[PDB]
Design an enzyme around this catalytic site. Structure first.
Site, mmCIF file in Angstrom:
data_model
loop_
_atom_site.group_PDB
_atom_site.id
_atom_site.type_symbol
_atom_site.label_atom_id
_atom_site.label_comp_id
_atom_site.label_asym_id
_atom_site.label_seq_id
_atom_site.Cartn_x
_atom_site.Cartn_y
_atom_site.Cartn_z
ATOM 1 C CG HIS A 1 -1.819 -1.231 1.264
ATOM 2 N ND1 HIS A 1 -2.729 -1.572 0.286
ATOM 3 C CD2 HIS A 1 -1.901 -2.198 2.208
ATOM 4 C CE1 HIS A 1 -3.335 -2.697 0.624
ATOM 5 N NE2 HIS A 1 -2.850 -3.098 1.785
ATOM 6 C CG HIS B 1 -4.256 -6.018 8.355
ATOM 7 N ND1 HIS B 1 -4.178 -6.572 9.614
ATOM 8 C CD2 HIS B 1 -3.726 -6.933 7.510
ATOM 9 C CE1 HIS B 1 -3.625 -7.769 9.535
ATOM 10 N NE2 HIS B 1 -3.342 -8.013 8.269
#
Length: 135
Positions: free
Chosen positions: A16, A130
């Site tokens: 990410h 996450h």
């Protein structure tokens, strides 16, 4: 899932934060080559790892994906991001997978945990693990 050589934080950074190319097809090759399959979709936040670590310092909130987890944190401000969507599957040859790219400016909610004692650098005791949701 993540390859064994990565801690959750390092995998979060790989999936990410470190978009190796502004083009999704190319950037996704990294994630796919490590996961051994073409991920259907993935979001790259155009922000720094340090910025995300600081978001981990914002108030704890329930994770939208899991009503039983309370280790999530809201970004507070929006950030530019690119969402990648698989357009052409290719399980036999993952290098042939192609993706579409969708640019946007959104808020995000990340789940954070204490670092991997043996493998994460002591510099960051708390790390993102996450990406729960983008809004």
């Amino acid at each position: 899932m993540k390859p064994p050589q990565f801690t959750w934080a390092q995998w979060f950074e790989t999936q990410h934060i470190n978009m190796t190319s502004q083009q999704c097809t190319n950037a996704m090759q990294v994630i796919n080559n490590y996961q051994r399959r073409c991920k259907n979709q993935n979001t790259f936040l155009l922000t720094t790892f340090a910025n995300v670590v600081n978001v981990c310092g914002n108030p704890n909130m329930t994770c939208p994906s899991n009503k039983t987890r309370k280790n999530c944190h809201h970004s507070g401000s929006q950030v530019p991001l690119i969402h990648c969507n698989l357009t052409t599957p290719s399980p036999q040859n993952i290098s042939n997978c192609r993706y579409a790219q969708t640019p946007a400016n959104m808020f995000y909610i990340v789940a954070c945990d204490n670092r991997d004692q043996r493998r994460d650098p002591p510099q960051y005791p708390v790390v993102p693990v996450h990406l729960d949701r983008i809004i």
